Design a protein around this ligand. Structure first.
Ligand SMILES: Brc1cc2[nH]nnc2nc1Br
Length: 333
């Protein structure tokens, strides 16, 4: 009789109380700059949707980062721009500095504040127990802010977390998949990386919310404290849910499907089978035990839930005992 509707438990109507211009990015007018102010130095990396370069602003001799966008729909460019401008100045949010366009090829490019070319994926293995809690707390600051601004990132993964370990700085980047949350709106489930897709994306439940980012955050935490990258290692979108079901169990999965009256793809009933909910001790060994604690396992369990409504919010996560020492040390400053 159709899926059961769902609402976010926090920041549900923040966009409703704002002017239309805040979230109606289709009508957003882009403030274009002059690309002659920037000279590219070297390429930093590629991607399906952009190429990233280190560049120099020749007007003030400032180092910047230039993201030349691949050809995508104009509304998607306006969405990333509007979200970056709404979140500008937020805690641990990357700063959009300028928007330029090649006068010949009409190719748009975003100019960001400079950050050291080193992300969370390259640094996790050398991090101590305290470093994991510290940087996870910094990620939660950025997530709680953008959620409070009515925006979900929808692509939380270590590759999108830039870290300057010398200064202990952290920046959340790549907002090309972020969207504004509106209660009752059905979103595209073809988002995020395979290993970080929430169960709602794999069962094709479109009325999701900020809680999607909290699942992806839980996938990062599990891979770091267990040193298993990725943690849920599926061969495809169907097998990705099977890998999750082999850990969280199938009974909670069918209760989740039953609660929201989700029409499960018939290709799943032959491959899901029957699996019990595993204990987190199964993934602990002598090489990751220094990163695993009862607080870490209790915090991880509250993030990786089938029911998106039962996962911790970003604000609830920041108050878990897992961060008690980090919060106390920041108060000492
Ligand atoms: Br700074 C920076 C900002 C980005 N936005 N999307 N990808 C990005 N990469 C780097 Br590096």
């Amino acid at each position: 009789s159709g899926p059961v509707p769902s609402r976010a438990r926090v920041y549900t109507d923040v966009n409703t109380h704002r002017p239309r211009e805040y979230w109606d990015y289709e009508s957003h007018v882009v403030e274009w700059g002059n690309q002659d102010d920037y000279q590219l130095v070297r390429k930093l990396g590629r991607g399906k949707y952009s190429e990233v370069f280190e560049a120099i602003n020749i007007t003030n001799n400032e180092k910047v980062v230039v993201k030349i966008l691949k050809p995508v729909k104009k509304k998607k460019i306006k969405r990333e721009i509007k979200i970056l401008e709404n979140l500008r100045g937020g805690p641990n949010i990357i700063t959009l500095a300028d928007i330029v366009k090649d006068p010949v090829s009409r190719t748009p490019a975003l100019v960001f504040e400079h950050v050291n070319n080193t992300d969370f994926k390259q640094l996790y293995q050398t991090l101590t127990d305290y470093d994991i809690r510290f940087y996870m707390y910094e990620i939660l600051k950025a997530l709680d802010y953008c959620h409070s601004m009515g925006i979900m990132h929808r692509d939380v993964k270590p590759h999108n977390v830039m870290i300057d370990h010398e200064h202990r700085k952290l920046r959340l980047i790549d907002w090309g998949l972020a969207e504004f949350y509106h209660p009752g709106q059905e979103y595209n489930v073809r988002v995020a990386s395979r290993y970080f897709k929430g169960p709602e994306l794999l069962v094709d439940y479109q009325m999701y919310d900020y809680s999607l980012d909290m699942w992806s955050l839980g996938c990062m935490l599990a891979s770091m404290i267990f040193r298993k990258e990725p943690f849920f290692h599926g061969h495809d979108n169907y097998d990705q849910l099977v890998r999750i079901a082999k850990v969280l169990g199938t009974e909670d999965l069918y209760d989740y499907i039953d609660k929201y009256n989700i029409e499960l793809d018939p290709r799943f009933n032959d491959i899901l089978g029957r699996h019990s909910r595993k204990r987190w001790e199964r993934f602990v060994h002598s090489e990751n035990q220094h990163l695993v604690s009862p607080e870490a396992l209790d915090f991880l369990d509250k993030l990786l839930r089938y029911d998106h409504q039962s996962r911790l919010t970003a604000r609830e996560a920041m108050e878990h005992p897992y961060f008690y020492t980090v919060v106390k040390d920041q108060a000492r400053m």
